[PDB]
Design an enzyme around this catalytic site. Structure first.
Site, PDB file in Angstrom:
ATOM      1  N   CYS A 235     -46.898 -34.652  42.371  1.00 17.53           N
ATOM      2  CA  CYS A 235     -47.214 -35.642  43.412  1.00 17.53           C
ATOM      3  C   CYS A 235     -47.199 -34.854  44.725  1.00 17.53           C
ATOM      4  O   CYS A 235     -47.973 -33.877  44.822  1.00 17.53           O
ATOM      5  CB  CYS A 235     -46.281 -36.850  43.314  1.00 17.53           C
ATOM      6  N   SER A 236     -46.304 -35.189  45.639  1.00 16.38           N
ATOM      7  CA  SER A 236     -46.177 -34.400  46.889  1.00 16.38           C
ATOM      8  C   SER A 236     -45.013 -33.417  46.734  1.00 16.38           C
ATOM      9  O   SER A 236     -45.245 -32.194  46.796  1.00 16.38           O
ATOM     10  CB  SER A 236     -46.030 -35.305  48.085  1.00 16.38           C
ATOM     11  N   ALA A 237     -43.802 -33.917  46.490  1.00 15.19           N
ATOM     12  CA  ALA A 237     -42.653 -33.016  46.226  1.00 15.19           C
ATOM     13  C   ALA A 237     -42.554 -32.650  44.739  1.00 15.19           C
ATOM     14  O   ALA A 237     -41.907 -31.641  44.439  1.00 15.19           O
ATOM     15  CB  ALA A 237     -41.372 -33.655  46.708  1.00 15.19           C
ATOM     16  N   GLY A 238     -43.148 -33.437  43.837  1.00 16.07           N
ATOM     17  CA  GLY A 238     -42.994 -33.169  42.398  1.00 16.07           C
ATOM     18  C   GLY A 238     -41.663 -33.634  41.831  1.00 16.07           C
ATOM     19  O   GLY A 238     -41.237 -33.019  40.836  1.00 16.07           O
ATOM     20  N   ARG A 241     -42.327 -39.712  41.979  1.00 19.63           N
ATOM     21  CA  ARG A 241     -43.385 -40.211  41.082  1.00 19.63           C
ATOM     22  C   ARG A 241     -43.489 -39.301  39.856  1.00 19.63           C
ATOM     23  O   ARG A 241     -43.623 -39.822  38.754  1.00 19.63           O
ATOM     24  CB  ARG A 241     -44.693 -40.274  41.866  1.00 19.63           C
TER      25      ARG A 241
END
Length: 302
Positions: A235-238, A241
């Site tokens: 996702c963004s940071a992993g 989500r």
């Protein structure tokens, strides 16, 4: 799916447990509060993530506080920069070596300067699937992920790597499916096929309106053999989500494989957190895991 008697019985057994929990939501809230109480302390992250925190690597991290542990980070080998220790912000997530159960690479949304690193990881780890659970930019116009895949301006290159999009298809559930081919420029060996699945309706630190699109990702991946290679999930940071998706995918595959321990979702999330800090970020995300697992077990037993 064609299920054996044992698999159908296990799905029914799991459904009664998971549905019982959603009917008693205080139980789910107590589990998540317990996980939050058992979180790792900052020195346990920092002193065990020495490569990620190295001065050569700090700019390769989208979020300074979301880094992989040394023990299970993906290492680029070979690597262009001999001083980087092969660093990419990426974690191998697994619950066993069963070839009936997918392993994941949980990673951040690539930065412009880590896109060659990302695609070299895809080739070196022979990842057949990328699951992308973010838009590139949020509705506040904050950038959440680099554009490592779009080709409308022309075919994409990242150092020695060439990327081609063979086709793009969308689904009624808002998924975007891209058939990608990646290869080195100066080789005679064949390109590598990667199915890229993007879900743009899962908000950061939030949850989708319903479980249907996330379960459609799992449904499309049921028949991808785990032995092909790790599934990239980012996702963004992993971690938020990404952790939520991995927990849904992993729990359903483990029920289908006869692993009773899949009924303890808190234990699953605890094990994920031992492999990447903070996997499953919010209580709504933890409830979404339960709702998606129940909904998918209802489909499997329909």
């Amino acid at each position: 799916l064609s299920l054996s008697s044992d698999q159908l019985n296990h799905c029914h057994q799991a459904l009664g447990v998971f549905r019982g929990k959603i009917q008693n939501p205080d139980s789910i809230a107590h589990e998540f509060t317990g996980l939050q109480a058992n979180r790792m302390w900052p020195s346990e992250l920092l002193l065990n993530s020495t490569v990620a925190m190295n001065s050569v690597n700090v700019e390769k991290n989208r979020y300074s506080d979301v880094v992989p542990f040394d023990k299970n980070r993906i290492v680029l080998n070979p690597c262009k920069d001999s001083s980087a220790k092969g660093y990419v912000n990426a974690s191998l997530i697994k619950t066993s070596e069963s070839e009936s159960i997918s392993q994941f690479i949980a990673t951040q949304g690539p930065l412009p300067h880590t896109m060659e690193d990302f695609w070299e990881m895809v080739i070196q780890q022979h990842c057949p699937i990328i699951v992308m659970l973010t838009r590139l930019v949020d509705n506040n116009r904050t950038v959440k992920c680099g554009d490592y895949f779009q080709d409308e301006d022309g075919p994409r290159e990242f150092g020695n790597i060439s990327l081609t999009t063979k086709w793009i298809k969308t689904t009624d559930t808002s998924l975007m499916l891209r058939n990608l081919e990646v290869n080195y420029k100066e080789t005679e060996d064949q390109p590598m096929s990667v199915l890229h699945i993007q879900y743009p309706e899962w908000p950061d630190h939030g949850v989708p309106k319903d479980t249907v699109a996330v379960r459609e990702i799992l449904k499309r991946l049921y028949q991808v053999p785990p032995s092909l290679g790790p599934i990239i999930v980012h996702c963004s940071a992993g971690i938020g989500r990404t952790g939520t998706y991995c927990a849904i995918h992993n729990t359903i595959q483990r029920i289908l494989a006869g692993d009773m321990s899949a009924l303890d979702l808190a234990k699953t999330v605890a094990l994920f957190r031992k492999q990447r800090i903070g996997m499953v970020q919010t209580m709504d995300q933890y409830f979404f895991c339960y709702n998606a697992i129940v909904d998918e077990l209802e489909d499997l037993t329909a």
